[PDB]
Amino acid sequence: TRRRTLYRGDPGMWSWVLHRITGATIFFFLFVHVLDTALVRVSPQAYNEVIETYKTPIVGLMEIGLVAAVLFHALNGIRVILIDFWAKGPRYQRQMLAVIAGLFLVIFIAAVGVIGMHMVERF
Amino acid sequence: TRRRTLYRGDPGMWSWVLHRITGATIFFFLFVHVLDTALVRVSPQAYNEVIETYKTPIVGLMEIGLVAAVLFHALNGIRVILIDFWAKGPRYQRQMLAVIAGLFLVIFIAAVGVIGMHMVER
Amino acid sequence: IQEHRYDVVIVGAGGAGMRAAVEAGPRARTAVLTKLYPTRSHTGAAQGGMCAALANVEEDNWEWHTFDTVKGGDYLADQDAVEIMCKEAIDAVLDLEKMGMPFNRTPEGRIDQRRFGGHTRDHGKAPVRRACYAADRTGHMILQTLYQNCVKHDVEFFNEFYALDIALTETPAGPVATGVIAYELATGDIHVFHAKAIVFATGGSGRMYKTTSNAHTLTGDGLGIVFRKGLPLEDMEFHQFHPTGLAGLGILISEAVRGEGGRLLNGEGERFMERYAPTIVDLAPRDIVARSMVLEVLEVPVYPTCHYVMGGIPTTVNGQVLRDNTNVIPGLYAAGECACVSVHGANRLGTNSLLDINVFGRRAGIAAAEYAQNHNFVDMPENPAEMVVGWVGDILSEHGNERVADIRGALQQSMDNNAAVFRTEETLKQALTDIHALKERYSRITVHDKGKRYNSDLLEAIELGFLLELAEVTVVGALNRKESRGGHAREDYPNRDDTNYMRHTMAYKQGTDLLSDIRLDYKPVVQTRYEPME
Amino acid sequence: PRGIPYFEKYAWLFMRFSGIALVFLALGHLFIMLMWQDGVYRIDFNYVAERWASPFWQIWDMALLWLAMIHGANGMRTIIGDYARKNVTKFWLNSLLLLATGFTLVLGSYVLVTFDANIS
Amino acid sequence: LGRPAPVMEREHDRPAALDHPRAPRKPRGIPYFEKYAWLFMRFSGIALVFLALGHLFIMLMWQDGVYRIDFNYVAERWASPFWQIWDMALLWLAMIHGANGMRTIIGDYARKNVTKFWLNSLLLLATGFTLVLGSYVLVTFDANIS
Amino acid sequence: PYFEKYAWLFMRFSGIALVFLALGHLFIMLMWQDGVYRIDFNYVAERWASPFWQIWDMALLWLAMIHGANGMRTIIGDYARKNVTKFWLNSLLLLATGFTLVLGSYVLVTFDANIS
Ligand SMILES: Cc1cc2nc3c(=O)[nH]c(=O)nc-3n(C[C@H](O)[C@H](O)[C@H](O)COP(=O)(O)OP(=O)(O)OC[C@H]3O[C@@H](n4cnc5c(N)ncnc54)[C@H](O)[C@@H]3O)c2cc1C
Ligand SMILES: CCCCCCCCCCCCCCCC(=O)OC[C@H](COP(=O)(O)O)OC(=O)CCCCCCCCCCCCCCC
Ligand code: HEM
Ligand code: HEM
Ligand code: HEM
Incomplete structure (x- = not known):
């Protein structure tokens, strides 16, 4: 028997689950992408072939998704490092969390705007 | 509260103080040497510039001081290694110290003579 | 039906139970029977301090404490045991500290003490700063420390084991206690623990009142068990009703109002306590304060709540269950709030309870361990669990038109409207008729589980039986005592008749079924130096 | 004493410091x-x-x-x-992780160290 | 009046019970790391x-x-x-x-353990920086840089 | 601690690769x-x-x-019967192994076809 139920606890819990998910995302991408970059010790034409197949609109929205993942992971990791090293850290947990929510929204709407204007002028 | 006391102990104590001081001197100099040598991957002219500024009389006196630091550190470190490995080391401590005082004197005055000749002929 | 061969067997895990367990832990092969976990015990509810004359902040000796404790109990306390308790109280507090308890410390670093109630300088002069405390949470720290030490010395706890009766073996020199028949809640299996000594530390019994301050698990089972085995109970009609009682439910309000400017304003918009009892503002004894408030109501909201029971199993100083006035049951000990060593007498002084449990739990544990070392196993009768197994089976396999909840609710409502802070003759007789009717209704009740894994209506019904017995004892004793002394207070006879009633009253169970009679004997009060005066 | 002593403390500290750099x-x-x-x-x-x-x-x-x-x-x-619930699963998954990580580090380091602009 | 008790707390992060007089002194690091750092200083001195x-x-x-x-x-x-x-x-x-x-x-x-921690971190950082910079310059050097 | 277990496992895995x-x-x-x-x-x-x-x-x-x-x-x-012999032989082994790894890695990393 296995019951299925949602705990509905702190917001730091959802921060941690997003942290874990985005970290694993970047790890798998990094494996694949170090390979395709290692294709540069083979041929300029091989490298150009591959990275040109990386210039499609699907891969563009995926670039936006990966930008989001790395940005959230970086901000939340700063929060975690602060909690651990700063002695008054655990008191301002939720303050830091709201601050990095704000920073993420700002920087990410800016980054989507820039990447979007590039994708627009490229079509 | 804090009192100022000179303990006035063994000569091995002053050997250890000098060993510590000269070792830290070499450590900091080495940080700087490695940076200014890393400057060899940017251009020939940048490297030539900074080392031409390292060929002055002030830096010549400093290089003599660095020779002294490295020489004393090496010799007293040989003494320390012998004390730790050779089973009759601790007996002959304080004779090793006289030996390395003499060695430092001869090697240092020879080296400073050669370096002073180089610095004169310019 | 398992059977364990053991030595000193402690029934309870509160302050007294775990004190006895850390004493008789190394000395013998001890088992501890608890119906809760050792840290869910009432002791943990204790917010106040624990007073012992350590003389750190001020200077005070143990004779001042002895006088305070003898005058508080309205001259019914055995002054032998009072002296012994104070003298050992100093060292009991120190031993708790040396076991690791986090007391509050003085600028110099010994132990901090603060004032409490009627602990006065010498025979009524000034407060003394006597009560040693840990925080707003003193009983919890005592409980945690004793449990940590029982963990350290690797005591064998039997958690959630409802001890339902004891096996008394009869010998030519009388009866002798052999084993305890427990009911493991977790598996339904009856266990029989064979012991040489048996310590009862099962706490008090306030749950026979509607509005009370005791845990839901404080029904009174040491009292009920030793009262069913034929042994007596001492002066059960002395219940201390606390004044601050959160008129809604009954929770105690000794949280903050105690050591501050609590303006007891009641009636419509008036202050009363000095209109009634001047010469002291509001630090009068708890029973006096409660009588005042109640007779005021008879002419944040608070209301008195049954708080403590001064009666219980009669006991010597070394912790032995004396059978009548001078005999003793061999191999049977008692400690804590279930035991009546006759220290509080007719009214309990604040902070003397944790003190009492420490001192006399240690004494009873030592005594039971050394008895188990000296003597040996005596015998046991044939399959001594027949009565308990028949009891449980009879309760289980039957169907009746009564519910434990309704019987218990009616018992508590009657015992609260009648045998309470003010009680009268016709009042107590109404209570007696009500308890007899409820006792004959308890014969036909039902349980709705019939399972054997975690059966709780079963034990709820058994505890209701215990409560009915103790309620009968209380009402009949309080109908007997025709005076107003201490927590007891009658409106027919309103002043302390010291010519006939300066004597403990003891109750013996004649029959064996529920509806039976009770014989009321007496017991003299040991007197050393403090003759009555007021 | 299940693994190498003080390895978890330093893995923890490394995650913090490498985060600051990364x-x-x-x-x-x-x-x-x-x-x-x-x-x-x-x-x-x-x-x-x-x-x-x-x-x-x-x-x-x-x-x-x-x-x-x-x-x-x-x-x-x-x-x-x-x-990972089974110890055999944990063993073989840690081995697969170590293998993939080593392969990626070896390939990336090779490419960086050996890259030459003039290849064709 | 008595003598006020001595405070045993060195700093906030330091359990006083760590410097208890009767407390057992047991090793506070990786086992056999000091032996090999000692031996390394000796051997690397001989080479240096x-x-x-x-x-x-x-x-x-x-x-x-x-x-x-x-x-x-x-x-x-x-x-x-x-x-x-x-x-x-x-x-x-x-x-x-x-x-x-x-x-x-x-x-x-270093008197405080926090100072010791952060100075060891600065030291490890500076040493790593110098090692990677020197190694890079040695490995990737070309005389025809201009 | 746990150095022998991992040396054992390394011999097995490096054998499979070798x-x-x-x-x-x-x-x-x-x-x-x-x-x-x-x-x-x-x-x-x-x-x-x-x-x-x-x-x-x-x-x-x-x-x-x-x-x-x-x-x-x-x-x-x-x-090796004596602890001093074991110490100095393990040191000689470590020295020779380090020298061979350093020389082989240098040659591989630095090899250039056009030398003369
Ligand atoms: C709210 C409140 C506040 C109080 N404040 C104070 C105060 O400030 N100062 C003070 O001195 N006193 C105070 N008291 C009273 C005092 O704490 C008690 O005298 C003391 O707690 C007595 O505990 P005990 O050792 O008798 O056992 P308790 O801790 O009361 O518990 C009895 C134990 O026996 C076990 N047990 C019971 N029945 C059975 C059974 N049938 N089978 C097996 N095991 C059983 C239970 O597991 C339980 O742990 C307070 C009481 C209450 C309710
Ligand atoms: C464990 C720690 C490991 C640290 C690793 C982190 C490295 C992250 C990136 C740092 C790269 C450093 C390499 C420098 C190469 C470079 O800039 O030099 C390369 C530059 C080209 O830079 P750009 O193309 O980006 O403009 O060439 C120049 O023309 C620079 C002109 C003069 C610069 C002098 C720098 C020489 C050395 C001084 C280093 C400064 C550090 C000071 C410390 C006190
Ligand atoms: C040149 C030959 C050298 C020899 C023979 C040598 C020997 C030694 C020895 C044996 C020690 C340990 C001393 C002790 O533990 O008491 C030591 C310490 C030290 N060495 Fe060296 N060393 C040499 C070069 C260097 C160099 C090149 C540096 C720095 C770049 C250096 C920096 C230090 C420092 C800082 C210490 C610490 C001093 C102390 O803790 O007392 N040494 N040296
Ligand atoms: C290539 C980039 C990165 C990769 C592949 C990566 C991957 C991971 C993974 C898989 C985890 C495990 C998450 C978990 O255990 O819950 C993790 C944790 C962590 N990451 Fe990263 N991450 C990256 C970048 C960053 C960055 C830029 C920071 C900035 C501070 C950071 C800070 C942290 C921290 C502090 C942790 C520890 C989290 C914890 O222990 O709870 N990471 N990382
Ligand atoms: C070619 C494939 C190889 C395989 C499959 C292999 C496998 C193994 C294994 C499993 C062991 C462990 C034996 C044991 O623990 O009892 C071993 C031991 C050993 N191997 Fe290898 N090995 C290989 C090649 C090599 C190479 C290339 C070298 C040296 C350059 C080497 C040198 C040794 C030595 C000296 C031992 C110690 C023998 C012993 O302690 O009994 N082997 N080998």
């Missing part, structure tokens, strides 16, 4: 790649070759590779330790 | 005698000392496997030697 | 075209102009040297 490394990489001149739409072999003709970017990319791979490998070690 | 003193001799005393040194001199010396390996061994041995020595120095001059 | 590495090396060297009788600097230079063979030889060097060094550590531990 903020700059990874976010500067993403910035300069995606939102500087034409983003991806300027990237090709010539772009890579003129970027890797600079000690700055060479050391930047090697530090990024090593820090990111050791960081991710330690994090996935933690994830495996929290999700 | 030759490496460092030969470096100093050839630089300062051989032909015209520093007054001959420039890019072309460096580029002629590093065209030889002998001098390449000599300088790589010198860099690695000297930096690990000095960093372990300064580990000792910090450990016995 | 089967392919070492036996492919021996095959391609001795019994492909003319065996040794074709080997010279030009052969080495055209073999080491390939990422395949470069990584093959570096993996072979590192795995083979750590494997052999651990095995000889075991042999010394089983044959």
